[PDB]
Amino acid sequence: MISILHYGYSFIMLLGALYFYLLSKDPKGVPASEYLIAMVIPLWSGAAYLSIALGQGLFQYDDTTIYYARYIDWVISTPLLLAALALTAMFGGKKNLTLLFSLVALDVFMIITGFVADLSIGTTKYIWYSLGVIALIIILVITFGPLRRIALSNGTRLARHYTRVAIYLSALWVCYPTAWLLGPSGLGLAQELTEVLVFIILPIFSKVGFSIVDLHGLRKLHQ
Amino acid sequence: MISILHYGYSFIMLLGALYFYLLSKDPKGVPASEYLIAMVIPLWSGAAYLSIALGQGLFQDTTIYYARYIDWVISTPLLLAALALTAMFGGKKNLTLLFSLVALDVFMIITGFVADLSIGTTKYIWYSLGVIALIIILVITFGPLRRIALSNGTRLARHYTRVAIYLSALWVCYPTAWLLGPSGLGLAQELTEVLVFIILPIFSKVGFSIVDLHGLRKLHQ
Amino acid sequence: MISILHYGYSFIMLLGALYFYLLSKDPKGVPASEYLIAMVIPLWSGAAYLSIALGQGLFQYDDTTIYYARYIDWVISTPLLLAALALTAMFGGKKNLTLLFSLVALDVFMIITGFVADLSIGTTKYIWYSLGVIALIIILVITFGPLRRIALSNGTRLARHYTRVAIYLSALWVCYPTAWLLGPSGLGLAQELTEVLVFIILPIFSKVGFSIVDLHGLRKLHQ
Ligand SMILES: CCCCCCCC/C=C/CCCCCCCC(=O)O
Ligand SMILES: CCCCCCCC/C=C/CCCCCCCC(=O)O
Ligand SMILES: CCCCCCCC/C=C/CCCCCCCC(=O)O
Numbered sequence: 001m002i003s004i005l006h007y008g009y010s011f012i013m014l015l016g017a018l019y020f021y022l023l024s025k026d027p028k029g030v031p032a033s034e035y036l037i038a039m040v041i042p043l044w045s046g047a048a049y050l051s052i053a054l055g056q057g058l059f060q061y062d063d064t065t066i067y068y069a070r071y072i073d074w075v076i077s078t079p080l081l082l083a084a085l086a087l088t089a090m091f092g093g094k095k096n097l098t099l100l101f102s103l104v105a106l107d108v109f110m111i112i113t114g115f116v117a118d119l120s121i122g123t124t125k126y127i128w129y130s131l132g133v134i135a136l137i138i139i140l141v142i143t144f145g146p147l148r149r150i151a152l153s154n155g156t157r158l159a160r161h162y163t164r165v166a167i168y169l170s171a172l173w174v175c176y177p178t179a180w181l182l183g184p185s186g187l188g189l190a191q192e193l194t195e196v197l198v199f200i201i202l203p204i205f206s207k208v209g210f211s212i213v214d215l216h217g218l219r220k221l222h223q
Numbered sequence: 224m225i226s227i228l229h230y231g232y233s234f235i236m237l238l239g240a241l242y243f244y245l246l247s248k249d250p251k252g253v254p255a256s257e258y259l260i261a262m263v264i265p266l267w268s269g270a271a272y273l274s275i276a277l278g279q280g281l282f283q284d285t286t287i288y289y290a291r292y293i294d295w296v297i298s299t300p301l302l303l304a305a306l307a308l309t310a311m312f313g314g315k316k317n318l319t320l321l322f323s324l325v326a327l328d329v330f331m332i333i334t335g336f337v338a339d340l341s342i343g344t345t346k347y348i349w350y351s352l353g354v355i356a357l358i359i360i361l362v363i364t365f366g367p368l369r370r371i372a373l374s375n376g377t378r379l380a381r382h383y384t385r386v387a388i389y390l391s392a393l394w395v396c397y398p399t400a401w402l403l404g405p406s407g408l409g410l411a412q413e414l415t416e417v418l419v420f421i422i423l424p425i426f427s428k429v430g431f432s433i434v435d436l437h438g439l440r441k442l443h444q
Numbered sequence: 445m446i447s448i449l450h451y452g453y454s455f456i457m458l459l460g461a462l463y464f465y466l467l468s469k470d471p472k473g474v475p476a477s478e479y480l481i482a483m484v485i486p487l488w489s490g491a492a493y494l495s496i497a498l499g500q501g502l503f504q505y506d507d508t509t510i511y512y513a514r515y516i517d518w519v520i521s522t523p524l525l526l527a528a529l530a531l532t533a534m535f536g537g538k539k540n541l542t543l544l545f546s547l548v549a550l551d552v553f554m555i556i557t558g559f560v561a562d563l564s565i566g567t568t569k570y571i572w573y574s575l576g577v578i579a580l581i582i583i584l585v586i587t588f589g590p591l592r593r594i595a596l597s598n599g600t601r602l603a604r605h606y607t608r609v610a611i612y613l614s615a616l617w618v619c620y621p622t623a624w625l626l627g628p629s630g631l632g633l634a635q636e637l638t639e640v641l642v643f644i645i646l647p648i649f650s651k652v653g654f655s656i657v658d659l660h661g662l663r664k665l666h667q
Contacts (some may be wrong), residue, residue, distance in 0.1 A: 032319040040326055047330070047352070047516070054345050056337070098476040105484055114498070176504050177493070255542040263549055268576070270553070277568050279560070 002193070005200050006053035012134060016103055018209035029222035030215060038211040041077045044211060045089050048073035058139070060121065060196060065192065070199060071115040075198050077207065079104045085143065089151040089162050092220070096150060103142060110135035118185050126138030132208055133177055140170060161217035168213055172206045225414075228421050229276035236269030236366055239429035243436070246259050251440040257302070258307050261432040264298045268428055286413065292336040292422060298428065299332060300325040306364065306390060307437055310372040320367060324360060331356035339406050350407075354398055359389055382438035389434060393427045446640055450497035453644050457490030460652035467659060473666035474624060482655040485521045486652050488540065489651055492497040492517035505563065506626055510637065515559040523553060523655065525546040529613060532658055533595040533606050535665070543590060547583060555581040562629050574631075577621055584614060612638060612657055616650045 017039045024035035048069045051057030057069025084105040089095060113132035117125050143166050151162035178200070180186055183195035236407045243405055246309025247258035271294035274280035301322040311317065334353035338346050372383035396419070397402050404416035461483045469480035492513045495501030501513025526547040534540065558575035561569050587610050595606035623646070624630055627639035 002495070036319055036323055044330075047334075050348075051337070054348065055339070056345070098480055102480055105480075109488075113491075116495070124500070127494075127498070142314075253634070259542055259546055259549075267553075270557075273571075274560070277571070279568070 003053050003055065004195055006049045008199050009204070010046040010050045010053065010202060012208065013042040013049070016211070017046075019208075020211060020215070022147060023219075028219040032220045034084065034087055036213065037080050037087075038215060040130070041080050041084075041207050041211065044076050045073050047202060051180050066118055066185075067199075068115070068118075071111060071118075073109060073203075074114075075111045075125070079107045081169065081206070081210065082107050082139070083135060084211065084214055085165060086147060088218065089147045089154070089158075089166055091114075091154060091158055091218060093150065093154045099142070099146060099150075099189065103139060106135045106142075110139070114180065125186075129177070129181070136173065136177060138174075147184040157206060161221070165210070165214050165217065168208060169206075172210070175202055225417055226247065226276050226278065226307065227360055228417065229272045231426070233269040233273045233276065233422050235425060235429065236265040236272070239265040239432070240269075241431060242429075246436060246440075248303070251443040253436065253439045253443075254308075257305060257436070257439070260308075261436060262299050264305075264428050265299050267297050268294045268424060287339050287421075289336070289339075292332060294424075295310045295335075296329060296332045300328045302427070302431065303328050303360070304389065305432065305435055306386065307368060309386055309439065310368045310375070311437055312375060312379055314375045316407075317371065320363070320371075324363060327360050327363075331360070335401065335407075346407075350398075350402070355393065359396060361394075364391060377441060380444070386431065386435050386438065388428075390431055393423060397424055445637070447497050449640060449644050450493045453631075453648070453659050454490040454494045454497065454568075455651065456648060456652065456666050457486040457493070460486040461490075461653070464655060464659070467663075473662040474488050478528065478659070478662070480522050481531075482659060485528075485651050485655065488520050489647060504567075509527075510562050510629075511643075512559070512562075515555055515562075517647075519552060521651065523551045525613065525650070526551050526583070526653065528658055529609065530591060531660065532609055533591045534600070535598060535602055535629075535662060537594070537598045543586070543594075547586060547591075549557055550579045550586075552568060554583070558624065559560045569630075573621070573625070580621065582619065587614060601665060602659050605665070609654070609661065613650075613654055616646060616654070619646055630667045 020035060020042075022036040024032065024039075027035065033178075034169065048057060051069045051072075052067060057072070058065055058067045060066075083100060086100045086103060110132045113128045117128035117132065120128055148159075148162065148166065151159045169190075176196070179190070179195060179198045182190045184190075184192055186197075243258055247255065247262075250258065271280065271290045274290045275288060280293075281288045304321060304342075307321045307324060308316075331353045333351045334356065338349035339355065341349055350385040351422065369387065370379075372380045400411070400416060400419045400423075403411045404419075405411075405413055406416075421422075464479060464482040464486075468476065468483075471479065492501060495513045495516075496511060502509055502511045502512075509665045516572070527544060530547060531539070532537075535550065549636045554576045557572045557579065559663055561572035561576065565573055592610065595603040619642070623634070623639060626634045629639075629644075630635075
């Protein structure tokens with residue numbers, strides 16, 4: 001069932017990428033870079049999850065299963081998602097690449113701390129986990145602080161769309177560290193099968209879902 | 224023989240980099256970035272192949288030359304960049320198209336490394352994904368990228384078409400040799416595959432850049 | 445002792461990053477990118493050295509201890525330091541990104557050759573070491589050649605500050621390959637404890653120290 005679920009995930013990611021390619025042919029005032037980003041995220045995630053379906057993207061550490069392919073996925077896909085968010089706030093204005101790369105730096109560190117925490121035992125696990133959570137808090141502060149102020153400077157309609165997308169992303173992202181802690185990698189209150197379902201359903205909304213809401217909103221500012 | 228051949232490869236790469244450095248001192252209207260790219264490719268490839276000569280860049284009932292993938296994951300995207308920048312010579316840069324090719328290429332090389340580590344059907348799933356990546360790269364090369372070259376004048380477009388065919392012809396050889404050799408069906412011997420992955424890169428790296436840079440320098444007059 | 449020293453290092457790095465964040469609030473004509481770079485260097489280095497303190501960032505190769513976390517540190521931190529140096533030479537003028545990325549390329553190769561040399565035995569070790577030294581020589585030629593000429597073109601006061609920071613960095617950087625050769629990774633004339641102290645004290649002056657001298661000099665040009 002675990003294998004079948006991952007095949008299904010990869011196929012949905014493929015259909016996501018195809019949809020975003022079609023949208024790109026009729027760009028409606030949205031730069032090609034934002035369509036490229038929306039295509040790479042699902043394609044990369046699909047390939048990583050395919051490696052799990054084929055039983056290559058995991059190994060047995062001590063007496064627990066590490067799905068390391070998830071981290072290979074997230075270390076590319078999550079920074080690209082934060083880029084898409086930042087570029088949404090900056091739509092019709094000057095780009096602030098310093099703020100954008102600050103988010104990329106924080107995000108990559110967040111994902112690495114998660115991978116190391118999964119490979120750690122005892123107290124050490126929760127030291128790394130904690131550093132990742134602090135990284136996520138700072139990303140949220142930027143998202144609702146300076147980045148939201150840039151969105152406001154680009155007009156009411158854009159700011160309203162940015163706020164909607166920011167809440168959508170924020171809501172989904174806080175679920176990842178929560179699920180991680182409750183599942184086998186953490187306290188082990190939740191079963192493997194449960195965690196797998198969560199890390200199949202969340203990414204679908206986090207990747208393909210986010211980009212639909214994000215791109216449709218921007219295309220609507222053109223009509 | 225395998226070790227000696229790899230030393231010889233690294234030495235030729237060094238001579239290539241030195242030649243491109245000399246050319247850069249008299250740039251003839253070609254941006255410094257295109258000279259830098261032409262220098263990095265051979266130097267990085269030389270270092271990787273050196274690791275094979277010293278017997279570090281491989282591990283073993285089949286021998287995997289993993290240093291090749293470390294080479295290609297840096298050198299091949301840089302080659303596609305040089306190609307893209309050739310199409311865009313004198314006109315506006317389209318970085319979205321350029322980075323699309325870098326994305327496709329890096330994926331192609333990773334699928335190859337995973338296929339080499341895979342057994343049975345799984346090997347050919349990964350191999351297939353890499354081939355599809357190469358097909359799309361070729362479609363971009365002869366489609367949108369060629370249309371940009373045409374928009375920059377007949378002289379530039381003619382040079383671009385020549386370099387595009389040159390690269391395309393050499394690149395299709397890599398997946399073909401991979402499939403026929405030990406990593407695939409095993410119809411060809413290890414020694415044969417080694418010779419191929421010595422001779423092809425010399426024409427793919429040092430050779431491509433000579434044809435590419437000389438053509439662009441000629442457009443100065 | 446070795447563990448405690450690494451904890452102390454990480455804490456000092458944290459304080460360095462916090463100081464540079466405060467400075468950034470009153471930027472005094474220094475671009476935000478240069479403040480971000482000064483913050484990332486210590487934060488990344490601190491995290492890497494923390495992995496050593498927890499005894500994760502090292503392993504036993506035959507009869508020697510390899511501190512591989514150092515290389516994970518340097519492969520990110522050293523290119524960013526050369527960027528800060530290059531951006532100093534270019535302060536008030538056009539950026540030359542080709543020259544900047546040439547330095548990044550050389551530096552990354554330098555650090556990789558070092559990691560491979562540490563994993564090598566006999567003559568092979570010193571082949572890789574040699575390639576890294578030649579990389580460092582070319583970096584020094586660029587620093588005091590074309591990069592210094594760019595600094596001159598941006599006025600006497602800037603050029604004087606650049607020359608001071610360039611010498612400071614150059615003096616500290618030549619110490620790394622020297623210590624490497626004399627310590628366990630090389631001829632083994634120096635003991636592990638000695639090498640550890642060197643690779644605690646040097647980075648503090650190389651990272652937090654360099655950025656203080658660099659940023660204070662540039663802030664002074666505002667007045
Ligand atoms: C943890 C890994 C960190 C790796 C990422 C390194 C990030 C540091 C780089 C900063 C580049 C700054 C962006 C250039 C500024 C352009 C001007 C602007 O702000 O718009
Ligand atoms: C698949 C492995 C990893 C690949 C990641 C590559 C990153 C893809 C995104 C790049 C963004 C491109 C930015 C282009 C900016 C200029 C846009 C233009 O004017 O055309
Ligand atoms: C050893 C691994 C090396 C990996 C990095 C290689 C980098 C090569 C690419 C260089 C890009 C040059 C950027 C050109 C910008 C033109 C504008 C300017 O020069 O100011």
